[PDB]
Design a protein around this ligand. Structure first.
Ligand SMILES: OC[C@H]1O[C@H](O[C@H]2[C@H](O)[C@@H](O)[C@@H](O)O[C@@H]2CO)[C@H](O)[C@@H](O)[C@@H]1O
Ligand SMILES: OC[C@H]1O[C@H](O[C@H]2[C@H](O)[C@@H](O)[C@@H](O)O[C@@H]2CO)[C@H](O)[C@@H](O)[C@@H]1O
Lengths: 474, 474
């Protein structure tokens, strides 16, 4: 990571250009260059580079992943003062509190809603059951009822939860990670009903995010399911759309998982004070959030003063209504195993590869399984960096070269104890043990430098291949 | 601390002899000697020796202190499996959960009750107000209404809370340590009313724990206030006593602070596996708790199977009733500042040294103040130990001598990086930094050993005066 700059990662479906305009204001006032990138598989890529002490200074994702990140030590603790705390809704801070500490800044509260084409469906269905009969008549006109992203369980979860599916049972303000509601009767009814939509050719097993967005925005489908970030494309879309409450299933409301979009600071960032100023003084203001909201809407934001202005919009109202019927995601580390499990279950049952309940029988135990964790970045390890090698005195061409270094905190305590002697001899007076993070293996390297004009010098240096914790006086 | 033994600290008002009989069973089965001690100022002494990596393997205290202990790193995390977890009431585990982890074993739930002499008061007063008028008539007969320990705010708290005093405001399952209810109208009414009892010679400012126990157990006072641990002396007391609900004040019930007596394991203990077996397999069984309960009763215990048997006792019922009207103490670190503040306030207002509200004005800000914390035992520091110095070869008298050693974890990361050379010369190929916990100052020592029978040898060794974290290759 580079000192004197901010690299920020946020999902490609969110308003990164808006966020980059906030970045520009910050550059103007401080000189600090903000870079906003949006890799794919972001929620997976961050722990992978951050475990190596690399990655962005700031990471944005819904709060359900952040418990996991914090456990492995990827996230700094954040230090908003009380005055800043009060500018945001307390329940949004709760979503980012983990083992008693705030591990990210909440930005916006997200929930799925039903997005409907008012010209094909003046009156959108209040229940899921009436969808087959409504797809019936739309297809008679060259359209379809409903498309949504079938590849991410986030979009199907609301339906599975409806009849009593749940992730980990929540009671007494705590989740029991051995009490998983993924193959109960309710989850079965929910998932089977989706599988029926597909078998009865009302939906298409392969339908993904862009396919659903295309279909709805070209007005070939009457409904889709999505979050506030999609709205932006539908205005400029030739579509006259509404945003409403999700339909009910077996008489019960759809229970979307609610996510608080959040910004965490990489524990490895040499730019924490910058990230703090950026987030508190630039992003989380009326104008910062407006800039992002202009690009891709955030939904019900977490800053009160700005949510007060946005609240007079039916679309936000609907987002909230849907939020209220749904439940906030836990942020506990076990969530990454739950999501993996449900993603397999749904894709498998949708594509015919397993029966429902033959898929959710497996997701049931898969969701409570122990998982491999992100290694902790404080451990002794090897770092790659690029440096230009120069002569200390003579004027020469300098080369840019990849080098490696060792850094970390050896876990063993260091100790020192007296030795006794009678030997009038010299001696070390102390027996000690101290572990240092050091090269275990390395190889010799040589580089020709060109000097003006006498003469060609050869610089040697060792290239470190591996590090380990070894005794100091070895 | 000694490997292969267990030293346990518990308060002198609790059943330590009973606990020592549990200790004997453990010795019999394992060979491990259990020692139970009961220092005074225990809740203060533990952090003081434990910050130096010393102290007992196991510490017993109500759970309100344990948050504080855990923050400074004095307590190991405990690892009961689910099967063990279910043997105890979930709300008792909640009292020992801190920042998401279990930091002690819950033993018993404690609450103050009104203990009354059935022969002087067949009908105990349901309210505090009717106490002056009842002391009136008892003193006419050479007795007094009520004595209790006025030196510990635990005993007066129930009265101060009654009309709306509170420690830190509790909402959303979290305490705001800037919202303290110590000089509100309710706390003022509560404390003033106690001060009136004293001014009107119904109680005595200096009355302490043993003074109250003496008076009640010699039948000179009709009532006292106390917890289950006192009951034991009152049976064998010539007193025919009852245990009932605390009286109401300004129409509201008395709100005792509820404490879950708990056993934590010293982070510095080389005997954690032993402490675990002791507590889980010996203390926390029907028979372990019975042994303690026989000595000094525990109250409503935390093990379900044993609380089921005890529940048919009016005294336990009353303890619980009083528990229900009261509130469980927070376990947050700020509690030690709250207690200090209220102890000053009460002693001062009772002895006339300040006005009420001139005392609680000060406790108000004192209770939310930052406090000095227990230093963390993992830091580089000096340890004292005793060792016998011998000759390695020749048979000699061995002396027992006090020695010092350095031990700890230096916080700075260790690193290692390549150097570049052109000098065809030797060199260290790496620039590195590594901190080790080492003697900063020391002094030379010499000791005469007597050998059989040739000849007198002198052993020298350095006595370490201080340790610090220094660079490895210095
Ligand atoms: O599909 C499982 C997935 O659900 C959520 O991801 C959402 C995210 O919260 C939204 O901000 C938006 O980007 O869409 C995503 C759905 O593809 C969870 O946050 C995530 O952890 C989980 O894997
Ligand atoms: O007086 C303040 C004091 O109250 C509590 O101490 C109780 C303890 O909980 C009981 O087990 C029994 O030993 O009596 C003590 C009262 O003297 C808190 O536990 C303690 O932290 C606090 O200082």
């Amino acid at each position: 990571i580079e000192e004197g700059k901010l690299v920020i990662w946020i999902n490609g479906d969110k308003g990164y250009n808006g966020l980059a305009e906030v970045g520009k204001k910050f550059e103007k006032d401080t000189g600090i260059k903000v870079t906003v990138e949006h890799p794919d598989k972001l929620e997976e890529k961050f722990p992978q580079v951050a475990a190596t002490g690399d990655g962005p200074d700031i990471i944005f994702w819904a709060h359900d992943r952040f418990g996991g990140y914090a456990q492995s030590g990827l996230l700094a603790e954040i230090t908003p003062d009380k005055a800043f705390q009060d500018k945001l809704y307390p329940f949004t801070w709760d979503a980012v509190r983990y083992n008693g500490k705030l591990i990210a800044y909440p930005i916006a509260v997200e929930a799925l809603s039903l997005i409907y084409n008012k010209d094909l469906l003046p009156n959108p269905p209040k229940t899921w059951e009436e969808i087959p009969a409504l797809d019936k008549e739309l297809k008679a006109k060259g359209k379809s009822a409903l498309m949504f992203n079938l590849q991410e369980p986030y979009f199907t979860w609301p339906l599975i939860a409806a009849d009593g599916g749940y992730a980990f049972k929540y009671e007494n303000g705590k989740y029991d990670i051995k009490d998983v509601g993924v193959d109960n009767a309710g989850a079965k009814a929910g998932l089977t009903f989706l599988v029926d939509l597909i078998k009865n050719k009302h939906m298409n097993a392969d339908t993904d995010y862009s396919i659903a967005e295309a279909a709805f925005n070209k007005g070939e489908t009457a409904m889709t399911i999505n979050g506030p970030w999609a709205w932006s494309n539908i205005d400029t879309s030739k579509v006259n759309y509404g945003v409403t409450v999700l339909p009910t299933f077996k008489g019960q409301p759809s229970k979307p998982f609610v996510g608080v979009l959040s910004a965490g600071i990489n524990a490895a960032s040499p730019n924490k004070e910058l990230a703090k100023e950026f987030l508190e003084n630039y992003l989380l203001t009326d104008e910062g959030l407006e800039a992002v909201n202009k690009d891709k809407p955030l939904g019900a934001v977490a800053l009160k003063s700005y949510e007060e202005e946005l609240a007079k919009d039916p679309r936000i109202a609907a987002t909230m209504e849907n939020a209220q019927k749904g439940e906030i995601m836990p942020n506990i580390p076990q969530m990454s195993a739950f999501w993996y499990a449900v993603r397999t279950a749904v894709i498998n049952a949708a594509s015919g590869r397993q029966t429902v309940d033959e898929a959710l029988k497996d997701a049931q135990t898969n969701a409570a399984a122990e998982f491999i964790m992100d290694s902790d970045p404080r451990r002794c390890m090897r770092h790659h960096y690029v440096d230009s090698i120069s002569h200390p005195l003579y004027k020469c061409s300098s080369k840019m070269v990849l080098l490696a270094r060792c850094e970390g905190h050896c876990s063993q305590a260091s100790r020192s104890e007296p030795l006794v002697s009678f030997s009038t001899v010299l001696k070390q007076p102390f027996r000690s043990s101290c572990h240092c993070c050091r090269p275990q293996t390395s190889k010799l390297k040589a580089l020709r430098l060109r000097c003006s004009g006498g003469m060609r010098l050869t610089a040697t240096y060792r290239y470190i291949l591996s590090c380990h914790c070894e005794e100091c006086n070895s």
